[PDB]
């Protein structure tokens, strides 16, 4: 006899009401309504709002027809908009975007003149034999640092004056006696990137004084490099084509390993932490692709290793049998 077969199926819904025809009048009205205001204020308010809608509407229309000359119309709608806003306190503060960007330097220093330069250049050139590609690279970043550092500095020092200009000469002021608001973020940013670059160059120094040769046979220290140049190592079409395809597969393999390596670490952290969520949702798939990626990662490394010993003990000489 027991049969609580719930036949009924409750499914009630609410009912909206577009009192206006604009997101503005909507968000606004709804806002005020949520804020709750006196009956007199609501009445006079709602009315005023209506008048505004009539003005803006009639405005856009007249604008399309081309009648707003004195511009007093658009100015009245805008003036009333801000006025009413600032009045009820619905104004607040509008933002302002501004940018000009820049990109032009070139520069061109001598070379090994200032001891600061010859110091490092000779440091590596002698500390080992970093003469040519190693030294060239050092310079790539060394001179690149000189131009980028004094360039950014010139910019920060350029804007710094962009406050006490007078087509004459800046007045006593480390950073133009400002009221703290502008130029602050510009000079700060300049110091952030320039200081960061400064630290970078400092590392370069420690590299030449500490980054001395030690170990390297995974990335592209000398291997992938010797292979890349191998093209100039007096080769032959056949031997080449073979070395080309082989390399492509290699460079592609190692490269991928690197990509999966970084993504693996990032995912690993996000995962390990995702497991602490305390619920279990993406832990499954996460752990899946996680272990998987790790697997292909290790396998890749092993591959690069084998191919490394081979391609290496092979490249050299480079007989006619392709090799």
From Swiss-Prot:
Sequence positions bearing Phosphoserine: 16, 101
Post-translational modification: N-glycosylated.
Region feature (Disordered): 1-18
Glycosylation sites: 234
Superkingdom in the source lineage: Eukaryota
Region (LDL receptor binding) location: 203-319
Family in the record: Belongs to the alpha-2-MRAP family.
Start-end of Basic and acidic residues biased regions: 1-18
Gene Ontology annotations of biological process type: amyloid-beta clearance by transcytosis; extracellular negative regulation of signal transduction; negative regulation of amyloid-beta clearance; negative regulation of protein binding; negative regulation of receptor internalization; negative regulation of very-low-density lipoprotein particle clearance; positive regulation of amyloid-beta clearance; regulation of receptor-mediated endocytosis
GO molecular function, one term: lipase binding
Matching CDD domains: RAP_D1 (cd14806), RAP_D2 (cd14807), RAP_D3 (cd14808)
Alphabetized PROSITE patterns for the sequence: ER_TARGET
Organism: Homo sapiens
Protein name: Alpha-2-macroglobulin receptor-associated protein
Modified residues (Phosphothreonine): 214
Main subcellular localisation: endoplasmic reticulum
Impact noted for substituting residue 256 to A: Reduces competition with MAPT for binding to LRP1
